[model samples]
Target: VGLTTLFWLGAIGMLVGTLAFAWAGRDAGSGERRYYVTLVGISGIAAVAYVVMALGVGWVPVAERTVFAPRYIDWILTTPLIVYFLGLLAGLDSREFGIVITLNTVVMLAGFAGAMVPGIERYALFGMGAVAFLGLVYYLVGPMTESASQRSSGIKSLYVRLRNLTVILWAIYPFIWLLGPPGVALLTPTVDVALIVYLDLVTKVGFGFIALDAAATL
Candidate 1:
């Protein structure tokens, strides 16, 4: 079963992220503002569903036979999150951030070998995911500051700094699981840990922050 704490935490993260975007874009024309908020909502729903299902809620389950299938399905499922975040970033005044987000999304897609090609080996997949995981930390931190940006620096700055830390923590999550003494008991290696954690954060926190930052700006 998936940890209830993680699933709920993921739910919270998604809501926070999307709300951030919605709040930032609120003053735009109603349609425009709604468009952004809708994107955030979509991202939020996906996060909740993915985390709850993947982690195995008591009421839900991952079929033992469907193990690898989840990988493929989950990979395809996360693309929308990347797209929403990127769209929101572009919709905002930060085209540079938008581009960076796009690149990060691409890096995440690379892990599944993008549907056509075979997935990368798990460890390598994690390393691949980490590329974006770490990148996102910097992405959030850099833009959150700057008086000229938008909104007060207080919320945005703290959000950025906190988000950056989250990514770093997220990026390290897999390694700890894989290489920690407990992980070693189960034969999880550093690389394997890295890969799983990478996927979790790229979709969860990476896009999570997009919604968050956007809301704050609004």
Candidate 2:
């Protein structure tokens, strides 16, 4: 209905997902357990961040609405974890993984800058972010996928599936930006927040569970 409702729902989803990840990681071996820990920590942190932002704290006012600084802060913390986690599954070389993570961080920080700035500055930052994202994507689907293919068939399949889902969902993020915040301002606050909430539900919580399910096969 409203942004408030969506925020609470998103927070709840994050909290529940955090608990699930914690439980999943509890029984995992040391190597895999850390991956689970990463998921749990990110989701749990995001749970609090979403609620705090929803309550009108840590947001910067834009036009008649507000953009949650916590959202970008959360992404800054979480996005690298996602890249690292997926990189692990892909069997990415340490050097390759580092490059991917670095590029991803740049992409995220640029997006944050885009959201915070105004007019031409916003688009400029977004353009930079887009270029970084494209580079990351190229590395992911190219070198990363090649690395994954060397694993066992089961892991290879799982890795490919996860990579595809992740990339596709991620590809939509810029479009979402265009529809909201510093991009074009085409959507109302309620609709914009709702779309973002659903996106997180699918990308973070939903994606976490999906990864966990595949992890079981590992």
Candidate 3:
């Protein structure tokens, strides 16, 4: 009901999902295993971060308290992996993939910057992040999906599912940023935290399962 309770539930779910991925990773090829390893690390750190925040340990005073630095740290690390996994699925060229990864990292960084700022300045940074998201999406749906379509029909279908699901989940993030604590404060802290945790559960854990299932087919 409360954010604290929701965070704990989200944290426990992440840990369980981590273990599940680790189990599944054992059967993955070397190329795919690294993706699984990153997922495990992301989920493991996410579990800890949520629990720490739930315990009131991961915030700092900023006019009022803000989410801890480690949460941003987690974002910077894990955000790029989404692009990496997409590259793996689509067989993107390493040079192009690296560029996309860098851009995706910038998106997370900008999002964090947006969250850290207060008042109208937050909107500017959010705009910057939104632009970055559009760039990433452009590359993904345009060139990346186009290239992927050249693969077998099954692989192409899997890539489409992965890309579309990622876009849908990630699309929710900007709205969350706008409505939740780090933005306009349109919701109570409990509601804000609850929404954030729920988003993480679906995007991280649910997305992990979807990705792993699709990757397993390759």
Taking all chains together, each candidate's TM-score versus the true structure is: 0.46, 0.94, 0.90
- Which is the leading candidate under TM-score? 2
Quantify how close model 2 is to the true structure by its C-alpha RMSD in Å: 1.4
Sorting all predicted structures by TM-score, with the top scorer first, yields 2, 3, 1
Tell me the tens digit of each residue's lDDT in model 1 across 1-218.
Answer: 23345445555656666676566556767555654655466545555664654366423122211122333344345544444443343234556556555655655565434222223344465566566655655554554234224645554444444445445555565454345322232533333423453455555556456445654565
Candidate 2: lDDT over CA atoms? Answer: 0.84
Error of 1 at 88 (Å): 5.4
Q: Against the unseen true structure, what C-alpha lDDT does each candidate score?
A: 0.48, 0.84, 0.79
- The local lDDT score (0 to 100) that residue 120 gets in candidate 2 is 69
- The order of the candidates by lDDT, greatest first, is 2, 3, 1
Which regions of candidate 2 deviate over 4 angstroms?
63-65
Better of 2 and 3 by TM-score: 2
* lDDT of each residue in 28-136, candidate 2, tens digit only: 8857777888888779888988898768678787655577888889888888888887898889888999899999999999998878775566788899999999999
lDDT of 3 by residue, 108-186 (tens): 9988887777667778888888898899989889989988887888878877887887788788888877887777678
Model 1 ranges with Cα > 4 A deviation: 1-94, 113-122, 143-150, 154-158, 165-169, 176-218
Question: Which window of 10 residues has the lowest lDDT sum in candidate 2?
Answer: 58-67
